[PDB]
Design a protein around this ligand. Structure first.
Ligand SMILES: *SC[C@H](NC(=O)CC[C@H](N)C(=O)O)C(=O)NCC(=O)O
Ligand SMILES: *SC[C@H](NC(=O)CC[C@H](N)C(=O)O)C(=O)NCC(=O)O
Ligand SMILES: [Zn+2]
Length: 259
């Protein structure tokens, strides 16, 4: 069944035993160090046009909490930036730690944030999501960090739905939600080519990591940690620490849209 997780027996360090590409040369996430970032004067701003009504479902698959969107036609689009054409929003999910002092997958100048939100988009010119996974630029992920601060009203909508998907395999209708309401005002970003941070770890992703964090309160973060990685018919296992350690940067440059 090729089951994997975040534990010592089935974690990141063993993923290559199931998917060789986990040891590839374009793996994510990475540590962003000021010493290896290059300002690209040609980088252009990106934008999004999300239809709140395209949101369909929220689910707990035992590895994270995912909100799924209708991507059968052009409804919710991401355009601009380093991209060659518009991308369709497929879903978003989160990565978080066991406590407020860590949780993000990407790290900036040696600092980690409480969580990392990933909005996954794919290029419709490739016809299907499965085909896009085979392309070096088939998927585009807008990554945003969560920092502890004031409570985020818009984020509560999501947190209020988690009670319906407490365990692995649960799913519930989640309608009328515009993920853009979670975006910080500042749009500065870093971009680089990498992979999915979860198996099969396909190296088909163009990353857009925003510089400015979204703030959320500690009580809000505690709510996320209330999920279980186990199914109803299983002994309780809290869903925390679903982040992959930084991978080698190797022969890649991270471009910044700011000087
Ligand atoms: S809540 C986030 C922002 N959306 C809106 O304000 C609603 C606009 C819709 N047209 C509507 O239903 O009124 C938003 O789009 N933020 C992203 C941005 O780039 O600022
Ligand atoms: S990147 C800093 C942010 N500015 C913008 O996103 C641009 C705003 C206007 N479109 C413009 O001046 O061109 C920002 O507001 N960051 C928030 C801050 O005050 O911390
Ligand atoms: Zn992710």
């Amino acid at each position: 069944a090729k089951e994997w997780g975040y534990a010592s027996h089935n974690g990141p360090e063993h993923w290559h035993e199931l998917y060789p590409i986990a040891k590839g040369d374009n793996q994510s996430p990475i540590e962003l160090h000021t010493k290896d970032i290059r300002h690209d004067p040609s980088l252009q701003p990106w934008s999004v046009s999300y239809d709140p009504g395209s949101a369909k479902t929220i689910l707990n698959n035992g590895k994270t909490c995912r909100v799924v969107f209708d991507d059968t036609f052009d409804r919710s689009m991401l355009r601009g930036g380093p991209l060659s054409g518009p991308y369709r929003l497929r879903q978003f999910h989160l990565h978080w730690g066991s406590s407020d002092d860590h949780g993000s997958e990407h790290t900036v100048d040696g600092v980690k944030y409480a969580a990392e939100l990933h909005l996954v988009h794919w290029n419709p010119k490739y016809n299907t999501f499965g085909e896009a996974l085979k392309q070096p630029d088939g998927i585009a992920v807008v990554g945003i960090f969560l920092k502890i601060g004031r409570e985020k009203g818009e984020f509560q909508i999501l947190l209020d739905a988690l009670d319906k998907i407490k365990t692995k395999g649960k799913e519930a209708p989640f309608n009328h939600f515009d993920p853009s309401c979670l975006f910080p005002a500042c749009r500065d970003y870093w971009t680089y080519h990498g992979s999915f941070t979860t198996p099969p770890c396909e190296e088909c992703i163009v990353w857009l990591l925003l510089k400015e964090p979204m703030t959320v309160s500690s009580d809000q973060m505690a709510k996320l940690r209330s999920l279980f990685a186990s199914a109803e018919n299983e002994p309780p296992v809290p869903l925390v620490g679903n982040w992959r350690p930084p991978q080698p940067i190797k022969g890649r440059v991270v471009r910044a849209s700011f000087k």
